[PDB]
RNA sequence: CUUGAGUCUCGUAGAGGGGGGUAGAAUUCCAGGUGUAGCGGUGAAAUGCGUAGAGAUCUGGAGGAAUACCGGUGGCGAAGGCGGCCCCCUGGACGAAGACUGACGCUCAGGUGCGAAAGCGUGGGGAGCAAACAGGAUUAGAUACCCUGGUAGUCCACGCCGUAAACGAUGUCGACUUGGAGGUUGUGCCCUUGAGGCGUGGCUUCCGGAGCUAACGCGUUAAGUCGACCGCCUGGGGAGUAC
């Protein structure tokens, strides 16, 4: 009756769009596809590579629950955008928690400055940093034991572009993209960027606040023409890329990957 | 496409940068289009036909993609 | 086009209520004033055919209005065409 | 009557004269009960391209609510005056009084 | 002749023939060479190889001016655009600027009619 | 991803040269709306502003000319 | 009487029209500098221009025409058509609410006007392009295609011409009938918590359902279902010709 109408609004009330409500129960595993059901129109064709943790083997059997992501519906049949992105929100919450007490305390091990700043990795993911943040002072972890264990103390974050730089050592110590597009510019600032779609001439890695990069086809590897990008890297993966070139005018930042 | 060789920059790299700049400008294409005169009708026809081709490529092939080849 | 103040004026004179603005006679007048205004323009700009097309449309519409008035109420039409000085 | 937006440019060697001309202009505008909402001496400025062989020139911006007749007069003055190399009288909807992005 | 350290190379690259002209920085030409003059005719002079050797010849010509630095301006569409500048480089000058100097009208004059072939 | 909509400007200013310089080419060209993602309504007026600047020698018509 | 039709109020976007200014690039020519033997052109050539200094290159000047990028199955216009900025005069369209008029409407034989390009007349102008023409090629021939030149014209003013595959090959006006994906331009609400969310109007591109269709296809912008008025067709040629 209005039973059903009340239920419809109830079920509205007890779900949300993003990957927030850990609801999808893993109802079939086979390699290389995991599948869930989060109260959506269809079941998600999940990769296995969203769900192996830090050493390469699976961690969740049948019945286990992780939320995925939404706001994109039915490319022709199916439902979702993947769940690790959901994990990105949890990582963002942990990073924000710092604000409360002005200190987020984890493990942070930064061996080398990709784009000027040491790369700091939190449990599964690894993020890239600006130079100063790796070290509180000129200490320079190159003389520290390789991949050492301290923490991360935040020096700098870009706040729209997920670039976060953190201070590994020294426990005692405690429109918009295109006007000032000179930050990752100079010649060779490398970046950690997720690829989006490979257009058979390109890969379209683009992460840094609403920009677009192309590592198109020529570099990508150390073979030129017989390469077919889909074979050689991935879909949806954070990689080594750097700028190599910027247009601020015709908005074509032409990244590379042969580096 | 004005360019200046940076200090301790290789020549070949500089040439490559220049070529890229030219490509961006579309100078060669510009020249090609202005070699002789195109009738307005012809210009219109080309533009329209190109758009039609683009639309075909966007939609019909997508539809085809839905179905598997083998 | 006609300036707002001039519209308001013409409405005041010919409209009975001065809020009406839609009265047939008022309308006729508005058209007539515009036609008068455009006469100088087109004296200057003889090839301005596109604008003249409007002018002609306005005339035709005025004309239809006059005919309507005639059949409805003859006297009022007479008074209107004495006020405006329309030969017919 | 109508809100015009004038920007005229003076030859740099005549920069010291610039105030008087401005005053003169202003006076005319006032004569016809024309208001003058904003007025910005931009000063000497490097040109994006050298007009009439010179590379710098003196910019003056100017905002006026004035009758068209005086505007026409001003235009004629500019065209005949050899000090001002370029001008741009440019209509506007409103009195815009807040001033310009780079004066800021 | 007066020696000059820095100067220009103008590269007029046509479809049919390339022309290299070295000049001083002011505008006064020092020497020049051509694919047609390098002994290339018809099919042969409309080629990158023809252009590079024309460039080489021009470089040889202005040896006595003892030019070291050079900026290049590339005109027109042709094969002798990249090849020419490479040849110039090889000839052993410090290339300072590479500029593209094609005359693009902003829709000025009517071009001649399309060929019917 | 248009800037003007987000800012909510009523009209583009030819005086605001820095804003303009973002939308012009290194060679001086006006940048397409495909690349900038500017809204059509906003693109037209931007072009108008650029050209007014060019007349005023605030912006150059092109990189080469002098 | 107010639903159709129209007026008034405030805005909106626009290559809509007419007039007058102006900007930059590029071509051409002139004058001068530097400089030296080629340039140019094609499939390949040759005619042609060049040592009386061309081509290239730099400086200065003249003049005409058109407005790169923006720029878009974007916009405006009855159609033809309209594209650099500025100003002046000017027509239409749309939306928002209200207020008014009160059927004033639709269509239209004759009639009247507008009407690409070419063309004509008189007077101006003349950079580039280019019917005609000339030369060089090609060829069996080449009164063509290609090359080198090149005059009417293209440009402006005022007249005439009144035609085009002037095409959506689809008359105008009104009503009704499943959908999707867009574009553009308004506008109402919504925490714009963000580029968004939910509507509601105008114009517009593509796909497609019922139905229609000889089929192709059209398909809420009909070529569907109906009404009003007009225009037009009656085998091919002869002929849109003769008188």
Curated annotation (Swiss-Prot), chain D:
Write down which residues bear the modification named N6-acetyllysine: 93
Q: Which GO terms describe its biological process?
A: cytoplasmic translation
GO CC annotation terms, alphabetical: cytoplasm; cytosol; cytosolic small ribosomal subunit
Q: Which residues form a coiled coil?
A: none
**Organism per entry:** Escherichia coli (strain K12)
Transmembrane ranges, per UniProt, are none
Per the record, the gene is rpsF
What interactions and quaternary structure are annotated?
A: Part of the 30S ribosomal subunit. Interacts weakly with uL2 in one of the 3.5 A resolved structures.
Q: What is this protein called?
A: Small ribosomal subunit protein bS6
Query: Which UniProt keywords are listed?
Result: Acetylation, Ribonucleoprotein, Ribosomal protein, RNA-binding, rRNA-binding
| GO function terms (MF aspect) | mRNA 5'-UTR binding; small ribosomal subunit rRNA binding; structural constituent of ribosome
Full-protein interval shown: 1 to 104 of 135
Q: Which domain of life is it from?
A: Bacteria
Reproduce the UniProt comment on modification after translation.
5 different forms of the protein, varying only in the number of C-terminal glutamate residues, were isolated. The sequence shown is form bS6-6, which is the longest. The first two Glu are encoded by the rpsF gene, the other Glu are added post-translationally by the RimK enzyme.
The similarity comment for this entry is: Belongs to the bacterial ribosomal protein bS6 family.
Q: What does this protein do?
A: Binds together with bS18 to 16S ribosomal RNA.
From Swiss-Prot, chain E:
The UniProt entry, under InterPro entries, shows:
Ribosomal_uS11 (IPR001971), Ribosomal_uS11_bac-type (IPR019981), Ribosomal_uS11_CS (IPR018102), Ribosomal_uS11_sf (IPR036967)
Q: Which GO terms describe its molecular function?
A: rRNA binding; structural constituent of ribosome
Could you tell me the Gene Ontology terms of the biological process aspect for this record?
translation
Q: Which family does it belong to?
A: Belongs to the universal ribosomal protein uS11 family.
Q: What is the stated purpose of this protein?
A: Located on the platform of the 30S subunit, it bridges several disparate RNA helices of the 16S rRNA. Forms part of the Shine-Dalgarno cleft in the 70S ribosome.
Among NCBIfam families, the record links this protein to: PRK05309.1 (NF003698), uS11_bact (TIGR03632)
The protein depicted here goes by the name Small ribosomal subunit protein uS11
Gene that this sequence comes from: rpsK
């Amino acid at each position: 009756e209005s039973f059903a109408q009340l239920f419809e609004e109830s079920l509205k009330e007890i779900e949300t769009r993003p990957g927030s409500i850990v609801r999808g129960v893993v109802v079939a595993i086979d390699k290389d596809v995991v599948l869930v059901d989060a109260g959506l129109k269809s079941e998600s064709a999940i990769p296995a590579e969203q769900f192996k943790n830090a050493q390469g083997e699976l961690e969740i059997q049948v019945g286990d629950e992780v939320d995925v992501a939404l706001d994109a519906v039915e490319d022709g049949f199916g439902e979702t955008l993947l769940s690790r992105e959901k994990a990105k929100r949890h990582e963002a919450w942990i990073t924000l928690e710092k604000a409360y007490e002005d200190a987020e305390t984890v493990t942070g091990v930064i061996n080398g400055k990709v784009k000027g700043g040491f790369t700091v990795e939190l449990n599964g993911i690894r993020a890239f940093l600006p130079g100063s943040l790796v070290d509180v002072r000129p200490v320079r972890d190159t003389l520290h034991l390789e991949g050492k264990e301290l923490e991360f103390k935040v020096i700098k974050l870009d706040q729209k572009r997920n670039n976060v730089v953190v201070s590994r050592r020294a426990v005692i110590e405690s429109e918009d993209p295109w006007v000032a597009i000179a930050k990752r510019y100079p010649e060779g600032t490398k970046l950690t960027g997720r690829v989006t779609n490979l257009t058979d001439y390109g890969c379209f890695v683009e992460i840094e606040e609403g920009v677009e990069g192309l590592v198109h086809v020529s570099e990508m590897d150390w073979t030129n023409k017989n390469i077919h990008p889909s074979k050689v890297v991935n879909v949806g993966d954070v990689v080594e890329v750097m700028v190599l070139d910027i247009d601020e005018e015709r908005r074509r930042i032409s990244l590379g990957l042969k580096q | 496409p004005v360019i200046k060789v940076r200090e301790n920059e290789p020549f070949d790299v500089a040439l490559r940068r220049f070529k890229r700049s030219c490509e961006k400008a579309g100078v060669l294409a510009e020249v090609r289009r202005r070699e002789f005169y195109e009738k307005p009708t012809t210009e219109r026809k080309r533009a329209k036909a190109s758009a039609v081709k683009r639309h075909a490529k966007k939609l019909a092939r997508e539809n085809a993609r839905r179905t598997r080849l083998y | 086009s006609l300036s707002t103040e001039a519209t308001a004026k013409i409405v005041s004179e010919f409209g009975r209520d001065a809020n009406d603005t839609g009265s047939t006679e008022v309308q006729v007048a508005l058209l007539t004033a515009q036609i008068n205004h455009l006469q100088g323009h087109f004296a200057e700009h003889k090839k301005d055919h596109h604008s003249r097309r409007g002018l002609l449309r306005m005339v035709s519409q005025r004309r239809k209005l006059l005919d309507y008035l005639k059949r409805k109420d003859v006297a009022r039409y007479t008074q209107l065409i004495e006020r405006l000085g329309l030969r017919r | 009557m109508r809100h015009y937006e004038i920007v005229f440019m003076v030859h740099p060697d005549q920069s010291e004269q610039v105030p008087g001309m401005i005053e003169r202009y202003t006076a005319a505008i006032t004569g016809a009960e024309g208001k003058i909402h904003r007025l910005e001496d931009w000063g000497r400025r490097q040109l994006a391209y050298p007009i009439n062989k010179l590379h710098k020139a003196h910019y003056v911006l100017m905002n006026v609510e004035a009758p068209q007749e005086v505007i026409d007069e001003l235009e004629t003055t500019f065209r005949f005056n050899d000090a001002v190399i370029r001008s741009m009288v440019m209509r506007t909807k409103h009195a815009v009084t807040e001033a310009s992005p780079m004066v800021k | 002749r007066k020696q000059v350290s820095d100067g220009v190379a103008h590269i007029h690259a046509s479809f049919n023939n390339t022309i290299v002209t070295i000049t001083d920085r002011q505008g006064n030409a020092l020497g020049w060479a051509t694919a047609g003059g390098s002994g290339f005719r018809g099919s042969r002079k409309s080629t990158p190889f023809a252009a590079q050797v024309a460039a080489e010849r021009c470089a040889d010509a202005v040896k006595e001016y003892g030019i070291k630095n050079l900026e290049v301006m590339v005109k027109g569409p042709g094969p002798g655009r990249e090849s020419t500048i490479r040849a110039l480089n090889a000839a052993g000058f410090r290339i300072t600027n590479i500029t593209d100097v094609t005359p693009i009208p902003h829709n000025g004059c009517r071009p001649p009619k399309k060929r019917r072939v | 991803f248009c800037r003007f909509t987000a800012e909510g400007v009523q009209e583009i200013d030819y005086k605001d040269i820095a804003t303009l310089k973002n939308y012009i080419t290194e060679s001086g060209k006006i940048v397409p709306s495909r690349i900038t993602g500017t809204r059509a309504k906003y693109q037209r007026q931007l072009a108008r502003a650029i050209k007014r600047a060019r007349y005023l020698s605030l912006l150059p018509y092109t990189d080469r000319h002098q």
